[PDB]
Amino acid sequence: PISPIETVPVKLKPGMDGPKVKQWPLTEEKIKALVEICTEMEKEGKISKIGPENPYNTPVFAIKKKDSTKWRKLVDFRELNKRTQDFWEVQLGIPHPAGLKKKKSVTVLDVGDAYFSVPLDEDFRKYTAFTIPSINIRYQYNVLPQGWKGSPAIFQSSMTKILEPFRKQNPDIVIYQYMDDLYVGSDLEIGQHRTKIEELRQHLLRWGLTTPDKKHQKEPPFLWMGYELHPDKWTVQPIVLPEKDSWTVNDIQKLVGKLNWASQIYPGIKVRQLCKLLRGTKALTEVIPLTEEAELELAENREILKEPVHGVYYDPSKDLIAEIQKQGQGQWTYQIYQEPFKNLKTGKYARMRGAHTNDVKQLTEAVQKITTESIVIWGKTPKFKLPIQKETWETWWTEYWQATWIPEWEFVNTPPLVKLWYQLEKEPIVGAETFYVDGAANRETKLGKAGYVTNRGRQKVVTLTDTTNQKTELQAIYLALQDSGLEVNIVTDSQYALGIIQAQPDQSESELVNQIIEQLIKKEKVYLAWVPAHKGI
Amino acid sequence: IETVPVKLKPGMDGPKVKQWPLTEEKIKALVEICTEMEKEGKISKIGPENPYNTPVFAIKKKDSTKWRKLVDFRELNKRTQDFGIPHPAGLKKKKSVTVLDVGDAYFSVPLDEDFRKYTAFTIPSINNETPGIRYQYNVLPQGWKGSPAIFQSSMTKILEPFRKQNPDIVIYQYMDDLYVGSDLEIGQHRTKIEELRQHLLRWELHPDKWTVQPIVLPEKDSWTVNDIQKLVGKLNWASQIYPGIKVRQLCKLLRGTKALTEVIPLTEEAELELAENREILKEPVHGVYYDPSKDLIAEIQKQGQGQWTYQIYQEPFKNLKTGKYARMRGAHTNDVKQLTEAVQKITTESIVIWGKTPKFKLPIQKETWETWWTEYWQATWIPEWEFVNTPPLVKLWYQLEKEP
Numbered sequence: 001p002i003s004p005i006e007t008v009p010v011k012l013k014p015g016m017d018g019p020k021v022k023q024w025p026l027t028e029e030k031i032k033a034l035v036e037i038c039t040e041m042e043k044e045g046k047i048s049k050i051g052p053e054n055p056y057n058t059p060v061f062a063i064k065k066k067d068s069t070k071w072r073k074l075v076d077f078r079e080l081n082k083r084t085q086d087f088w089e090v091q092l093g094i095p096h097p098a099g100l101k102k103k104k105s106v107t108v109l110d111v112g113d114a115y116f117s118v119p120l121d122e123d124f125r126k127y128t129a130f131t132i133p134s135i136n137i138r139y140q141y142n143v144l145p146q147g148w149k150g151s152p153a154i155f156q157s158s159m160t161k162i163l164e165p166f167r168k169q170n171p172d173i174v175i176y177q178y179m180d181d182l183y184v185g186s187d188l189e190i191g192q193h194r195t196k197i198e199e200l201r202q203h204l205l206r207w208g209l210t211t212p213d214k215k216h217q218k219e220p221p222f223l224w225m226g227y228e229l230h231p232d233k234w235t236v237q238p239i240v241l242p243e244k245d246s247w248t249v250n251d252i253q254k255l256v257g258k259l260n261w262a263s264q265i266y267p268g269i270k271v272r273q274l275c276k277l278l279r280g281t282k283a284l285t286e287v288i289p290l291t292e293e294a295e296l297e298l299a300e301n302r303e304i305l306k307e308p309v310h311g312v313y314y315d316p317s318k319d320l321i322a323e324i325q326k327q328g329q330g331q332w333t334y335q336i337y338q339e340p341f342k343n344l345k346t347g348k349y350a351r352m353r354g355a356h357t358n359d360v361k362q363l364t365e366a367v368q369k370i371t372t373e374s375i376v377i378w379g380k381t382p383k384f385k386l387p388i389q390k391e392t393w394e395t396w397w398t399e400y401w402q403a404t405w406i407p408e409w410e411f412v413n414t415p416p417l418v419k420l421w422y423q424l425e426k427e428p429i430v431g432a433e434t435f436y437v438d439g440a441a442n443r444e445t446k447l448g449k450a451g452y453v454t455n456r457g458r459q460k461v462v463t464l465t466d467t468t469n470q471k472t473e474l475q476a477i478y479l480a481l482q483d484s485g486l487e488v489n490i491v492t493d494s495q496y497a498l499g500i501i502q503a504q505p506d507q508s509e510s511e512l513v514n515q516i517i518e519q520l521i522k523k524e525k526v527y528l529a530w531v532p533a534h535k536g537i
Numbered sequence: 538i539e540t541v542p543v544k545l546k547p548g549m550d551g552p553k554v555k556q557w558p559l560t561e562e563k564i565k566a567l568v569e570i571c572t573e574m575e576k577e578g579k580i581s582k583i584g585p586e587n588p589y590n591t592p593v594f595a596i597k598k599k600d601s602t603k604w605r606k607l608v609d610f611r612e613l614n615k616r617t618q619d620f621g622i623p624h625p626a627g628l629k630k631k632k633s634v635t636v637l638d639v640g641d642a643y644f645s646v647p648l649d650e651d652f653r654k655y656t657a658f659t660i661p662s663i664n665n666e667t668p669g670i671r672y673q674y675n676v677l678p679q680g681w682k683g684s685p686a687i688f689q690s691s692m693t694k695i696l697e698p699f700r701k702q703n704p705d706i707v708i709y710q711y712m713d714d715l716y717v718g719s720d721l722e723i724g725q726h727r728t729k730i731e732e733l734r735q736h737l738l739r740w741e742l743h744p745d746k747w748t749v750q751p752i753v754l755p756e757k758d759s760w761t762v763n764d765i766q767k768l769v770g771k772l773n774w775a776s777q778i779y780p781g782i783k784v785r786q787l788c789k790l791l792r793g794t795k796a797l798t799e800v801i802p803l804t805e806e807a808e809l810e811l812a813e814n815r816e817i818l819k820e821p822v823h824g825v826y827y828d829p830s831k832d833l834i835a836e837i838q839k840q841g842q843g844q845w846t847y848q849i850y851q852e853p854f855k856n857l858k859t860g861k862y863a864r865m866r867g868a869h870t871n872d873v874k875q876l877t878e879a880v881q882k883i884t885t886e887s888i889v890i891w892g893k894t895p896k897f898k899l900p901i902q903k904e905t906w907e908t909w910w911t912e913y914w915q916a917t918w919i920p921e922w923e924f925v926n927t928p929p930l931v932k933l934w935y936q937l938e939k940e941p
């Protein structure tokens with residue numbers, strides 16, 4: 001059935017013209033079917049015949065429904081879609097379960113073939129020209145065509161208008177459109193709810209939009225991209241891991257993919273040894289001998305995934321609480337809840353060390369990421385429970401070179417606490433050895449020397465094969481740190497070292513930097529100073 | 538009224554910037570504000586057939602507890618054609634200036650039909666449970682560059698009387714704001730401002746006090762190897778600005794593997810060299826002149842303890858102005874607050890002085906900034922910015938700025 005709604009003006013992108021592709025030759029059976037089917041929607045007014053005044057054409061296909069029984073049709077709009085204008089956002093984001101609120105009842109109204117109910121822009125219609133050839137009849141769409149770029153866009157806005165009055169009339173009823181499904185929830189008593197649904201159904205019917213009756217309507221639980229939605233709680237469908245005897249590269253990858261998704265809900269899941277089987281993989285279908293370490297790991301993961309998890313929905317009248325935990329260097333797990341242990345959402349992040357960072361900086365980044373997803377989901381920011389002392393945060397941020405911040409938070413004594421691994425002295429140490437370190441290397445030959453000399457007479461130097469200047473400088477610093485006692489003063493002219501003085505990183509991409517880092521941590525008191533190069537010093 | 542045809546620069550297309558997530562609190566504020574404007578015919582709902590978009594958000598000014606809608610037309614403005622438009626070099630000398638929000642005036646004037654599409658903006662929804670509410674302007678939009686331009690005529694008329702009867706007062710219009718400066722003492726100034734308000738209805742700053750501060754060098758009774766080392770480093774780098782600065786005589790004292798704590802007596806030669814350097818530092822470098830055809834740039838450096846330093850320049854080391862900034866009372870626990878405030882004051886000065894907004898180089902991670910800048914913004918305009926890594930040397934230098 002067609003509807004009396006204002007068509008949305010659709011034009012082809014500036015400078016382009018309608019489709020003109022060839023029509024495939026078909027079997028008499030594929031033709032018979034298309035003739036019959038097309039005559040059907042023809043009588044319905046969905047499609048109208050056209051003459052030679054239309055030079056456009058789209059390829060029509062015929063595919064039997066699941067397993068060669070009755071015949072169905074398909075139109076390949078690929079080209080037309082390329083020439084059609086762009087519309088605004090189709091779905092600017094999906095509602096995450098943790099952002100929903102509980103309802104006494106929810107019903108989904110499949111407005112199925114409503115696409116063919118909304119009238120297309122009359123002018124544009126011509127571009128939808130297609131043909132049913134003989135073995136040895138032209139048509140065009142008068143309504144939104146299945147597969148056409150603009151259909152979903154137009155269809156959505158249409159439903160929006162049509163529903164505007166019903167929503168106003170019923171501000172206690174929640175509707176949510178997704179594709180051709182209409183999710184409607186409420187907190188009314190079942191009988192009342194049933195009534196309003198019908199009223200809605202009739203309101204839609206008033207615009208030709210046919211919808212199924214109670215006898216043919218779907219109901220909860222609702223499978224929503226991973227979650228199993230219930231009117232009072234959402235559930236995570238326990239993930240199944242196939243116990244194979246022979247594994248291929250491809251298989252391992254897909255496995256790790258599913259496992260990595262799981263880790264958000266089930267922290268504890270590990271894939272280190274499983275990822276290790278990919279090293280040097282020559283082909284996607286090559287078989288890999290599962291290392292016992294991987295067997296133990298894969299097994300432990302199945303136990304974890306045995307216990308299904310279910311949580312609660314958002315309660316607007318309650319505060320939001322976000323707690324974070326560091327599982328390892330650069331790994332943080334967080335869970336957001338309103339009532340302790342009654343989780344809304346959980347998650348984790350893996351931070352590739354990158355250039356040079358420190359745990360507090362990483363904590364900061366977690367806090368940041370969380371704050372953002374919260375705003376998108378709940379429209380507000382959580383109060384944070386962070387495994388770090390107010391003293392530590394204060395010391396670090398007040399002197400850090402970059403602007404940084406953490407919203408209202410509260411320390412939670414849940415080990416392991418994140419702390420400052422070391423802190424360079426602000427002024428030279430009295431009664432401490434002074435190492436004047438320096439390193440240089442021939443850029444081209446990759447050959448260098450790293451060394452130092454102390455005010456206490458101590459000296460050293462090393463020749464380095466296959467090194468770079470930046471490395472040499474750092475190596476010098478490493479040596480000074482190795483041969484020095486608990487207290488050390490080190491002067492260098494390395495501009496790169498200036499980075500450490502400022503950022504004081506406790507993790508880096510460079511293994512060498514890390515060596516220095518470990519040494520710095522071991523020291524009681526270190527004072528690092530920089531002096532300009534090629535001068536008197 | 539009859540509308541002037543506005544167009545995009547040739548070959549350009551409308552902005553298609555995505556909306557940032559907004560808090561419940563401000564989504565509400567916007568919906569309310571927009572339903573009202575819609576009734577008043579300022580804006581209209583649009584369909585998906587319009588693909589353009591521009592970010593929107595709400596802020597409350599200090600001394601204001603009522604939400605005010607703000608749009609990010611930066612992208613559009615950049616694509617909107619240029620169009621006579623003055624800047625009084627005397628406003629920079631006034632004893633006092635007052636900023637005025639004349640944004641409302643624009644809503645009276647209609648916007649050319651064909652350009653309206655390009656002003657599309659979207660009110661989002663919490664958890665995407667509802668489609669975005671799409672609107673577009675029908676009248677002149679606040680924060681757009683074309684608006685002050687087209688309203689120019691009407692504006693000059695309205696002001697001419699106050700102008701002719703008070704040629705001793707300077708009035709400058711930069712977008713939604715009007716800067717009124719006078720040398721008249723606070724009494725007459727404030728009263729004359731209130732009068733000017735009424736004049737408009739019917740239809741505190743201090744400009745040169747912003748004196749560039751010199752770089753002061755430390756003074757000790759006795760200097761240590763470390764002290765000298767720090768000093769020499771500062772100067773060596775500083776020679777990029779003042780080439781007359783020498784550091785050899787001092788560097789000479791630094792020869793030898795001495796302990797950093799070792800006390801060193803200055804040679805009469807070194808003493809001179811230093812005294813001479815202080816002299817050169819007593820005043821800003823010669824040869825720096827503003828070029829209206831080049832972009833203005835502002836660098837900011839977190840100095841800790843609530844202090845921040847900045848430099849406005851067009852070419853590196855050739856600074857037009859430099860200054861320090863102490864955090865406002867209230868932001869005692871957060872940088873983002875202090876930074877935005879700083880950004881705002883600096884942009885203002887740039888306006889007063891050159892009538893142009895500086896491109897900022899901010900010492901902050903993009904994410905941190907994007908997430909919270911709106912929460913503290915209180916200006917009708919939005920300047921350009923990029924995120925950078927503060928070089929240790931440039932920081933140590935400006936740290937040495939003179940104070941009262």
Ligand SMILES: CC(C)=CCOc1cc(NC(=S)c2ccoc2C)ccc1Cl
Nearest residue numbers: 100101103176183184185229230231666
């Ligand atoms: C996202 C989605 C599939 C919603 C329908 O399923 C549920 C939704 C809710 N709660 C809300 S607030 C709702 C219901 C219809 O539309 C909305 C926005 C609760 C339980 C289920 Cl099972």
